[PDB]
Specification:
Chain lengths: 101, 145, 141, 206, 67, 80, 69, 55, 63, 143
RNA sequence: UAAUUGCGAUAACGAACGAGACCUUAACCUACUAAAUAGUGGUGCUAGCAUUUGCUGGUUAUCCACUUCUUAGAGGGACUAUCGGUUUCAAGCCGAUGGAAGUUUGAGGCAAUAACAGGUCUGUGAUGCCCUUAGACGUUCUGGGCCGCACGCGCGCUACACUGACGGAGCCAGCGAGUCUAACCUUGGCCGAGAGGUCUUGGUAAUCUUGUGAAACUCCGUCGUGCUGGGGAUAGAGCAUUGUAAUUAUUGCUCUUCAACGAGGAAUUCCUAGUAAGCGCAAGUCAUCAGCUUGCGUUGAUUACGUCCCUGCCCUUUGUACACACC
């Protein structure tokens, strides 16, 4: 019966949301405390650069944005139940890291 | 409360170290009007020579004026730090000086002449009269007169 | 016990959280009495809901305000909005509707909106100029 | 007067004065009437104000600036030139000082002297431009009351500025003496000199 | 300014033409009706449809339209 | 070794793939088909395979020194 | 150029032009009699220490004073 | 080099200011190849069958 | 001096080559039926009181 | 009926506590109190030479009371100013770390501040006690 | 109408692209879900003053409860809403009231037919052809230059001061960024006027730097209209950091030197509300160097809700011997 932390992050919002729904779902048929997920502020990777490949024309700029979304859920679970969750729940793009402490 | 009731010994423009010192301005800025010496060293000289900071140049008469002048000619003996003077580790002696009213121009021209005689690029630039610090003369420096 | 309520006030970036409870009747900002806020000219501006309402309505409440963000004018406006909202929320939840409605009448009669945040927000800056609408000077020659 | 003393002090001076009447700092916003017609509904003195610092939206629609009370307009016209484009807390301090100098120069109400100054320096007949092939002739034209009030305030503050750029006299003293002369037009105020040259050139060009 | 476009005008005229008895004179009810009897894909567009529908219904109950 | 594994797929709806169309026209132009010929081949192939709009903008110099760009459009294309 | 040191003729003047006008300030003193500012401020401090003038308000930029009654 | 540079009587800001200024400093431009750009400069006229046999 | 207090009824239109001189319909607060056109420099609504020193100009479009 | 430094005004308290610390005087100021400019962002040394360090001491004491734990870097950031870099625009440069650390350790050898865990210095029981007593005498200074 | 935006008139009737719609963001939510990586209240222990119960604190897990304030998933909310007036009585516009919001709700992203002999061969192992290809026009090492100065032009920064400068005191943001098979952001302590240096500490980051305790700003003092304590340009000496290397000052700090400018001619730029303007901060290139640019926040106004007078662009009607299209 080990108390672990499970942090997920991605750039794809709805894929991340259904991953989190799957995690809270399976925790809730096998209840541990309740542990609803907590929402970090979204990190906006801004990259600003020139439109023009050369240095001619009207000086116009661009701002590309990456959005990083990150959530965490705590689980207090045996070993086989931890392994079943962290190996069954898997989707592309969403990087999930599981830590013991 | 600092009204001064003195009548006769207030004096007009006075003399200290080959300079016309204004007699109706504050003592720190009259020392600033003395050449070779600026505001912060003037204030330190007044505070340290125990001269009354609050008032102009009419009193702060002779005996503190010679205390003032001796503290300028030999700052180093009385706990003025070495970094507070204008010239240190000088040229051929290494002991720390402060140049005053005429010695400042005499000795700035002297070390300019020193580097001119060592035939430095700084010397050639000063001889030509162009900008001796690294500066762009392409666009500025017009109308030297 | 402790019949308390929590309200807020929002200027451009200042948030002021005001805790209003039923006690002896004191009024305080950031652990200090409000007669000690330092713009020293907007002392009347923090006095505004006090002197609109009346001291007897303030004579039985303790309001404590915690203050974050924004410049000093943003602080004083967030305080004023937060304590006016605290008065109207306490009077809504504990006392009579004519009392709160007459106070709303006074507030909207004198109002610099007094209870609702200014929707004015700083628009983002565009390229080609150092301001939101101003652009760099051109020469043509 | 029924003061209520709390743990926090809330001093009795502001207690009594601003519980009894919504003043200025300490100045009555009643008993003030616009001495002349043609300027009512625009010079807003019917609603009292404690301090001219208000976050009021005035430039959205047509004439919410005409709805705005006049003392804030005096501050926001004192706000000009690039040295102090921004410092209206300080401008409010200046305006309070001007009102005090008004009180010491004359016992009457400082908002009333402001009203009298605007009334006596609103320019009654301006002159507009016409194409007019040749010398580009101009033609006289009367002025809407809000433009009257606006140009009046502009003349007040520009006269104070030009008379107090490089002088020992402060902005508060200069604006106060300009306000006194504009209340009693004595052919000394910059605002009424500008008004008089406007009427003279318009009467000549009509 | 606030000129309504061909999309909202065309949809509002078709809806008012074929659904006159069920429509009401209020915006809230009418926009719920538009939600149910139209498979519209945009929320702000839905509100615009309902607003022009309500205005045209006001004009219908006041008098005849030439449209 | 063993931490990455490749896999393959036929691409369902192979007709409505823009990179596939560009690759096919690279192939036909390398074969030496006429520009007009082959480009109409792709536009009609896309429209028959079942898209809602298609366009090709072959652009460059072909036989003259001057370079033009003739646009073969068929179907319905949003642009904003 | 002005006079910044009270030579007692400016002193017994300012003692007899306290009642001549109403509005006392630094610039008012400077224009009414030629005193170089700082001495006028010292005179204001002396006169508020013992007031034949009363304060309407004090400010580090400007001080507004009226006669005693 | 060094001694010649310091002993050259020609060099100096004062001598440069003594000399006058030419008009090429205040001339503006010669934009001939932007004034005439529609007209072909290669001279290679594009011909009908090249266009047809190509595009 | 014959100062005249006027009262606008309707606005006629924004004449002026640059487009600032508004034409309005002034009554003169003494006779309901005595009215005339006026050219005004500033911005104008209904129900405001203007002032005239010459009430006999009767002007028209400015070029 | 309840006294705190929050309940007393800033300027009058800071002046009264400066005068109080002048009247005791056990501060052991460093020797270079007249040379310094209190920051590299200044150009003139302080005017009131006889009490500028003690006004600084009163200021630091009030800051330590109002906050949990701050250090010399935070004090330099607070008492820094705008540096006039000539023709270049102004910039925020921190204050004089030497005189800030000297006033911190002067208050420490008085016994007003102490070393707190996780770094920094925090207020002491007797420092807060005498600060509250002076906050009192400033509250009941009314005639 | 912002709009070929829509009414209407009507040999046209229906449509499609562009506009709009759409998306992203800033506004509102006491409504759901939450949260020791965010706060709040209370219960312990403890400090002080008053002790008359209180106020101010601390307290990494002493525990409980909550989500108003922080975050954002699902949603809602505004649609010129209601009324009055005008209009072809329509499209719409003006005002009032309500509401967080009545400027296309503010601001962007993408943006049709097309062209231009517009710019880039110096971004590309994208490139045809040409030139060169070993005394190389390839690559690599050393040094210099790109910064050189009689002068002309363009973008900016500091200023010409008291609506200020100088010294203390008060304290107030937001956008972000930050190190593994290496040397990032640096807290705290200690030395030093300062710049900076040494011991460590924390952070792969809502955890720490950091509440980025920023500047402008407020109060109290000094200065008193003087080329002045405005201004800090030129200029000399020393102390440090970065880097193999600072000389042609890299940059920072200290002292000294104290120029011109007293508001700017002809002209001309930008701008309609959290706007101009003032004021700073972060990121980019970075070992170092920001007077630049991109974003953000603080303080925050005047005047107008029009017109074709000027200047550009569009459409229509006209004229054409032009169609490579007035080059
Ligand atoms: Zn590539």
């Amino acid at each position: 019966i080990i108390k672990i932390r499970i942090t997920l992050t991605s750039t794809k919002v709805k894929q991340l949301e259904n991953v989190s729904s799957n995690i809270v779902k399976n925790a809730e048929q096998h209840n541990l405390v309740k542990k609803g997920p907590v929402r970090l502020p979204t990190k906006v990777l801004k990259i600003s650069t020139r439109k023009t490949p050369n240095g001619e024309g009207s000086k116009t700029w661009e701002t590309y944005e990456m959005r990083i979304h990150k959530r965490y859920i705590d689980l207090e679970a045996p070993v086989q139940i931890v392994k079943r969750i962290t190996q069954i729940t898997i989707e592309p793009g969403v990087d999930v890291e599981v830590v013991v402490a | 409360s600092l009204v001064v009731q003195e009548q006769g010994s207030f004096q007009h423009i006075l003399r200290l170290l080959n300079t016309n010192v204004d007699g109706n301005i504050k003592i720190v800025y009259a020392l600033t009007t003395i050449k070779g010496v600026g505001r912060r060293y003037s204030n330190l000289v007044c505070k340290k020579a125990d001269v009354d900071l609050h008032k102009r140049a009419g009193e702060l008469t002779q005996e503190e004026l010679e205390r003032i002048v001796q503290i300028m000619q030999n700052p180093t003996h009385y706990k003025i730090p070495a970094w507070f003077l204008n010239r240190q580790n000088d040229i051929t002696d290494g002991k720390d000086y402060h140049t005053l009213a005429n010695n400042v121009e005499s000795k700035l021209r002297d070390d300019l002449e020193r580097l001119k005689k060592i035939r430095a690029h700084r010397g050639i630039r000063h001889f030509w009269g162009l900008r001796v610090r690294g500066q762009h003369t392409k666009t500025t420096g017009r109308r030297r007169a | 016990a402790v019949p308390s309520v929590q309200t807020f006030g929002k200027k451009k970036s200042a948030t002021a959280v005001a805790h209003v409870k039923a006690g002896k009747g004191l009024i305080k900002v950031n652990g200090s009495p409000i007669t000690l806020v330092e713009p020293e000219i907007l002392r009347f501006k923090v006095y505004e809901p006090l002197l609109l309402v009346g001291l007897d309505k303030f004579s039985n409440i303790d309001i404590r305000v915690r203050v974050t963000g924004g410049g000093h004018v943003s602080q004083v406006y967030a305080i004023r909005q937060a304590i006016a909202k605290g008065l109207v929320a306490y009077h809504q939840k504990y006392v009579d509707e004519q009392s709160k409605n007459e106070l709303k009448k006074a507030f909207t009669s004198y109002d610099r909106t007094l209870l609702i945040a200014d929707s004015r927000r700083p628009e983002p800056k565009k390229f080609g100029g150092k301001g939101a609408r101003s652009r760099f000077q051109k020469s043509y020659r | 007067f029924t003061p209520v003393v709390l743990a926090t002090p809330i001093p009795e001076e502001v207690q009594q004065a601003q519980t009894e009447i919504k003043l200025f700092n300490k100045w009555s916003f009643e008993e003030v009437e616009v001495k002349d017609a043609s300027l009512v509904d625009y010079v807003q003195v019917r609603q009292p104000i404690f301090v001219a610092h208000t976050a009021g939206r005035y430039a959205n629609k047509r004439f919410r600036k005409a709805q705005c009370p006049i003392i804030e307009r005096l501050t926001n016209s004192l706000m000009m030139n690039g040295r102090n484009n921004g410092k209206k807390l300080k401008a409010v301090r200046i305006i309070k000082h001007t009102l005090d100098i008004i009180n010491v120069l004359t016992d009457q109400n400082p908002i009333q002297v402001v009203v009298d100054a605007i009334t006596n320096t609103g320019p009654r007949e301006d002159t507009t431009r016409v194409g007019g092939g040749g010398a580009a002739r101009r033609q006289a034209v009367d002025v809407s009351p809000l433009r009257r009030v606006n140009q009046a305030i502009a003349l007040l503050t520009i006269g104070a500025r030009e008379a107090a750029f490089r002088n020992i006299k402060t902005i508060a003293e200069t604006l106060a003496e300009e306000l006194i002369n504009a209340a009693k037009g004595s052919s000394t105020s910059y605002a009424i000199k500008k008004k008089d040259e406007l009427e003279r050139v318009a009467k000549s060009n009509r | 300014g606030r000129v309504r476009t061909k999309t909202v005008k065309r949809a509002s005229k078709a809806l008012i033409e074929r659904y006159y008895p069920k429509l009401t004179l209020d915006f809230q009810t009418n926009k719920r009706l538009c939600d149910e009897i139209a498979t519209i894909q945009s929320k702000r567009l839905r509100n615009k449809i309902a607003g022009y529908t309500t205005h045209l219904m006001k004009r219908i109950q006041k008098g005849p339209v030439r449209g | 070794p063993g931490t990455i594994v490749l896999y393959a797929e036929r691409v369902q709806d192979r007709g409505l793939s823009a990179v596939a169309q560009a690759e096919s026209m690279k192939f036909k132009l390398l074969n030496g088909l006429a520009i007009r010929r082959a480009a109409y081949g792709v536009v009609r192939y896309v429209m028959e395979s079942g898209a809602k709009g298609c366009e090709v903008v072959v652009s460059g110099k072909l036989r003259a020194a001057r370079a033009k760009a003739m646009k073969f459009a068929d179907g319905f294309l949003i642009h904003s | 150029q002005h006079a910044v040191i009270l030579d007692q003729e400016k002193y017994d003047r300012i003692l007899k032009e306290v009642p001549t006008y109403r509005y006392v300030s630094v610039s008012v003193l400077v224009d009414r009699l030629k005193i170089g500012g700082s001495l006028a401020r010292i005179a204001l401090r002396h006169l508020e220490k013992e007031g034949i003038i009363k304060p309407i308000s004090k400010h580090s930029k400007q001080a507004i004073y009226t006669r005693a009654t | 080099g060094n001694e010649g540079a310091i002993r050259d009587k020609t060099a100096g800001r004062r001598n440069n200011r003594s000399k006058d200024v030419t008009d090429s400093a205040t001339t503006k431009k010669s934009n001939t190849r932007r004034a005439t750009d529609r007209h072909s400069r290669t001279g290679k006229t594009d011909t009908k069958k090249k266009v047809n046999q190509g595009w | 001096t014959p100062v005249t207090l006027a009262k606008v009824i309707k606005v006629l239109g924004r004449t002026g080559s640059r487009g600032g001189v508004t034409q309005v319909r002034v009554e003169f607060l003494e006779d309901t039926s005595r009215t005339i056109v006026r050219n005004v420099k500033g911005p104008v609504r209904e129900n405001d009181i203007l002032v005239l020193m010459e009430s006999e100009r009767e002007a028209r479009r400015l070029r | 009926p309840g006294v705190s430094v929050r309940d007393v005004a800033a300027q009058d308290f800071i002046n009264a506590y400066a005068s109080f610390l002048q009247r005791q005087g056990k501060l052991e100021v460093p020797g270079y109190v007249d040379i310094v400019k209190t920051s590299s962002g200044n150009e003139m040394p302080p005017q009131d030479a006889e009490g500028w360090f003690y006004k600084r001491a009163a200021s630091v004491a009030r800051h330590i009371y109002m906050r949990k734990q701050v250090g010399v870097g935070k004090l330099n950031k607070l008492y820094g100013g705008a540096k006039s870099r000539g023709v270049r625009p102004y910039k925020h440069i921190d204050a004089s770390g030497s005189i800030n650390r000297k006033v911190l350790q002067a208050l420490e050898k008085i016994g007003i501040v102490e070393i707190s865990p996780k770094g920094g210095r925090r207020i002491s029981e007797n420092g807060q006690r005498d600060l509250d007593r002076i906050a009192a005498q400033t509250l009941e200074e009314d005639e």
